[PDB]
Amino acid sequence: KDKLNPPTPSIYLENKRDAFFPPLHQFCTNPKNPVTVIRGLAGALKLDLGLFSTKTLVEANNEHMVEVRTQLLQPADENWDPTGTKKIWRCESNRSHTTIAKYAQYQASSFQESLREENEKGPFKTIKFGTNIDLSDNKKWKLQLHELTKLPAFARVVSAGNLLTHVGHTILGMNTVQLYMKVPGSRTPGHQENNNFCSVNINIGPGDCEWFVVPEDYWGVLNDFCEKNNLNFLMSSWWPNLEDLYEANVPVYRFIQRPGDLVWINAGTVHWVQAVGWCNNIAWNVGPLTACQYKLAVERYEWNKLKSVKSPVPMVHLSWNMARNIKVSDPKLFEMIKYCLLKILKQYQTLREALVAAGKEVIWHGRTNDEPAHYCSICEVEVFNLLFVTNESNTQKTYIVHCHDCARKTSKSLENFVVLEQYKMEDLIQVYDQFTLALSLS
Ligand SMILES: O=C(O)CCC(=O)C(=O)O
Ligand SMILES: [Fe+2]
Ligand SMILES: [Zn+2]
């Protein structure tokens, strides 16, 4: 069907008024729109994209680290096995590091070489893609990060309506900006965002990017394809074969992102991207306060546990911060958070009572203001409140955190561990009891 090649939801902006118009925010966060392309966004806000040009970046922090992916330059929208015999999902994406200065040299020489060639199945050429460049440090990137505060609030890296702001600590590349330096064919293979959070991406130019998008509710189909092909959906590099998707009745949105266009990837939307020209991009995540965002983040948090993959977003910590600090006025979102908090509380009460009944001391440890969430040093599951720390790490005050299961596996009666408690039961109960639905007429 042509239902399988649907039009891209698109907003055409001319000025600041259009950027700040509330129906824009509502359109982006509507779960029926898997992606929204906001055309002309940089022009409409007079955003200086020159602050993100390769020349500017080299002048600012020439030795800054760049993760390099070395990839094959594949034709059009296809991915061929290295022999050029058949189309397959697995893609070659070998990893190394470089600096902004060194990648910039390659990006520029790549272009000059193409000019020279223009003045003249595979085998394919190799290219390098500069990815995951960390723009978190405000003392290194002051002017760059300041420019992004010109965005409307809903798309900012930091805002009161962004769940990632309510985490209360840094999650690199999610509530901090990542930069991408590209040459033609540079590919970001198929993925959903970490914990299914929305993503914001602005193309710096001067070249274009081509995007491929599949709605969230088809992700199981793509997971199945990965498994049938010996690939890990979450952890492997794959580039979908569009003919497979079409055969499976999976709709694919496909579009070009020009310099100054902002791409809003909605919660859980599956996507893969390739540079058509030479360009840089910037991106980060946002978490709208909607039932849909929270539900999908929780779902992926739980799926990640089943797949033994770390969740970058500590959904337990976050849920407590929401209850402590956010007046929630949507009944559906409210009931979800409340439901999660009750599960957390009851599991905590069950575990704490079992420890005490076995005669294990629970040590009052408290918490430093703004301390990040903890994850198990062995299995990387989030660990909330009750921390299992070895007698030796306790003595040394390194406080190396384990979950209960990992501690028990090591030490059958927890004889090798102390149990540290960061929050009093009565204090968590009060937060839960006082978390009630606020009235909004909106
Ligand atoms: O620009 C890229 O290659 C990264 C795109 C992406 O995955 C995102 O913005 O979420
Ligand atoms: Fe992405
Ligand atoms: Zn563990």
Author numbering: 880 to 999, 1023 to 1344
Provide the publication's sentences verbatim.
Despite reports stating that UTY(KDM6C) is inactive as a KDM, we demonstrate by biochemical studies, employing MS and NMR, that UTY(KDM6C) is an active KDM. UTY(KDM6C) catalyzes demethylation of H3K27 peptides in vitro, analogously to KDM6B and KDM6A, but with reduced activity, due to point substitutions involved in substrate binding.
The first helix in KDM6A and the linker region (residues 886–902 in KDM6A) that connects the helical and JmjC domains are not observed in our current crystal structure of UTY(KDM6C). The UTY(KDM6C) JmjC domain contains 13 β-strands and 10 helices, including the extended and distorted double-stranded β-helix that is characteristic of the 2OG oxygenase superfamily. Analysis of the electron density at the active site supports presence of 2OG in the cofactor binding pocket. 2OG coordinates the active site metal in a bidentate manner via its oxalyl group, with a water-ligated coordination site adjacent to the predicted location of the substrate Nϵ-methylated lysine group (as observed in KDM6B and KDM6A enzyme-substrate complexes). Notably, the unusual (within structurally characterized 2OG oxygenases) presence of two cysteinyl residues (Cys1111 and Cys1181) in the 2OG binding pocket is observed in UTY(KDM6C) as in other KDM6 subfamily members.
